[PDB]
Amino acid sequence: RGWFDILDDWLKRDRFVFVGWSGILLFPCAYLALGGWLTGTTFVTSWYTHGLASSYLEGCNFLTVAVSTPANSMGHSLLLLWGPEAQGDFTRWCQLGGLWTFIALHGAFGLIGFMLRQFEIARLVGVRPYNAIAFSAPIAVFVSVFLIYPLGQSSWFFAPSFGVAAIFRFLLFFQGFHNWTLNPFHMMGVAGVLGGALLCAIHGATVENTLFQDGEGASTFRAFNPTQAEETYSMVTANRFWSQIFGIAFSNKRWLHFFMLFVPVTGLWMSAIGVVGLALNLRSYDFISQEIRAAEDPEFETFYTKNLLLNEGIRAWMAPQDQPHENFVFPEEVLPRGNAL
């Protein structure tokens, strides 16, 4: 037995928390994503990168702490601790935003390890790796939103900051500058997520309200034996119920659970794609036909034009604080405003 085979026996041992080769990539990168967030939302500012407080130490609460992105002046720098910006100075690295890349990059190899981990376990147990495949959609998102999107912009500044309210900031930026709601690829994303939740609820409730009576107590949970051969609910009565309620129903149980994987996994993939577009300011922002008409007919109004005026107000009221590095100075008198407000 070669030493390689001995090290493999030990990693693939059956313990409380299984390790594997995947573990060697996984636990340190994940642990350190986590810790860099915890450490930075507890103790670290965004004052020199953003002009913001961002830690508990400064008096932020759980909703407003963030590990905030690096200042725009850093470019797409990896922002290595031993790099030329921070030069081994830990303290300076924190203040320049290196925890953000630290988290981003250890996170991304973290997710890799997790996907390999689903591959490694599925192979050892002996099942199809459909869960690993499903986990492609979170990876497409994380990559598309956190890495690709900023690489297409001027710097990491404009990527998302790791924070509850900071993410809300990203959301609204995407509305006012990218008009993300109008994008077909997000719409498909929306449909997939809400359709996922739909599938999730309706299938659980169907199964729970078609159970066979297999015990005798009023708690029905104690009439299921994991090794029993018999379906625990009635596919036949579920079909008839939804056939007559909704006009159609599932008849095939495999297709039904395969469709359940498909719908949300595909929604997330679609949204990823559109965001790749937004890396380039390749937006679906306007409809040319409506603008040409609008420009000529001051009595032509639609909810599309109403929304654009909203977008315009967001851009101008929020940019000076949002992108402090541009030194945006807007006098009161250029700020767009309707009557009175």
């Binding site: 009576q213 107590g217 009023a218």
Partner: peptide, 19 residues
């Protein structure tokens, strides 16, 4: 009398005619 589930021995839908 079916709050605890469908009785396999007399599942009602099975006594009905296909739609």
């Amino acid at each position: 009398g079916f709050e605890k589930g469908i009785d396999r021995e007399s599942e009602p839908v099975l006594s009905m005619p296909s739609l």
